[PDB]
């Protein structure tokens, strides 16, 4: 027939695929590299710029930009390259033939949706498109109509309650902490152990170290006492060149800044106190049924032990007499995509698209009134 494309811009990884199947068949980092060093050899096939896995393969020579910072698209000329590369190289599909579904964090600036629509109609000529909240799609993914969704990727963290499919817009919280600024903190603590990572390539090395070795302490002060008193906790990783680095309390100490953002020096409280403050902004009749479903989403929630750390300190905040249930499926890194894959395959949803006629009639302003 014709089948929607489903795309999640995120920050860091792009993940894209066709609606109505179970995992994305293109995943790659949303990264654009431009070569900086003088090129000596003649007739090398040297190229303007590289996107995704090309840029990370060659990332020694390149400078690596991210075009999306804190879920805001900061540069458009790169982002058009990233979509062009996704459709033509990654999916090998002409976007005229398929409606497209696009994904975003809530409370980001209006003009992001306008430009993201305008580029999809004018340059791609996508026949119809929709833009959907990440958190909402995580419920379609985990199979619920009720819950408070805590979502963190790279860039933005946000919390949205939903009760029987009605969002409660006054209680949405957003926080800029997750993902990249954990890595920028990990650099700064690693310097204290004598290793220095500055370049954009080294930032990708630190990001891989974080993904392998970090884990969340059940109690932060007990484990700092242990790691001071012992070497038992200490793990070593081999850099690409074969130098080897050894890491102690820093590996649990890095993700603890999610719970105590004072380490990096933000104002606001950790994800648990924004979760509890979000439930507190909901009306008292529903609250039991948000406490009874908490849904974690996006890759920054993948750290081992983060689920029981949440359940443990939220329980300590919450009224004593209630279930706290933290739901964190192992698939959760892809949940926003899987939920959009489900949504775009509903039959009811086929009325929902912004069609090209409607854009020609109204201009990109329509996206605000038609979409959430």
């Amino acid at each position: 027939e014709t089948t929607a494309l489903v795309c999640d811009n995120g920050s860091g990884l792009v993940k894209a695929g066709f609606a109505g199947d179970d995992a994305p068949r293109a995943v790659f980092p949303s990264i654009v590299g431009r070569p900086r060093h003088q090129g000596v050899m003649v007739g090398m096939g040297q190229k303007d710029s590289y996107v995704g896995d090309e840029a990370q393969s060659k990332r020694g020579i390149l400078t690596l930009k991210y075009p999306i910072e804190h879920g805001i698209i900061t540069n458009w000329d790169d982002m058009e390259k990233i979509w062009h590369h996704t459709f033509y190289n990654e999916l090998r599909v002409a976007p005229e033939e398929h409606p497209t579904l696009l994904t975003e964090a809530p409370l980001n600036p209006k003009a992001n949706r306008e430009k993201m629509t305008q580029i999809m109609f004018e340059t791609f000529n996508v026949p119809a498109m929709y833009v959907a909240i990440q958190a909402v799609l995580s419920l379609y993914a985990s199979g619920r109509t009720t819950g408070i969704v805590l979502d963190s990727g790279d860039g933005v963290t946000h919390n949205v309650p939903i009760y029987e499919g009605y969002a409660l817009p006054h209680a949405i919280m957003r926080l800029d902490l997750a993902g990249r600024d954990l890595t920028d903190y990990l650099m700064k603590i690693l310097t204290e152990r004598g290793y220095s990572f500055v370049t954009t390539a080294e930032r990708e090395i630190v990001r891989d170290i974080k993904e392998k070795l970090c884990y969340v302490a059940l109690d932060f002060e007990n484990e700092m006492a242990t790691a001071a008193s012992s070497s038992s906790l200490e793990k070593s990783y081999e850099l690409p060149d074969g130098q080897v680095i050894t890491i102690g309390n820093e590996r649990f100490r890095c993700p603890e800044t999610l719970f105590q953002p004072s380490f990096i020096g933000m104002e606001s409280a950790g994800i648990h106190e924004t979760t509890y403050n979000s439930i507190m902004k909901c009306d008292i009749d529903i609250r039991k049924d948000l406490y009874a479903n908490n849904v974690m989403s996006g890759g920054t929630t993948m750290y081992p032990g983060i689920a029981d750390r949440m359940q443990k300190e939220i329980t300590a905040l919450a009224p004593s007499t209630m279930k706290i249930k933290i739901i964190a499926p192992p698939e959760r890194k892809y949940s926003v995509w899987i939920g959009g894959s489900i949504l775009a395959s509903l039959s009811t949803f086929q009325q929902m698209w912004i069609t090209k006629q409607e854009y020609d009639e109204a201009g990109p302003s329509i996206v605000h009134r038609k979409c959430f």
Partner: peptide, 7 residues
């Protein structure tokens, strides 16, 4: 962003 944060 446009004011507060850098992007």
């Amino acid at each position: 962003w446009x004011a507060x944060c850098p992007a």
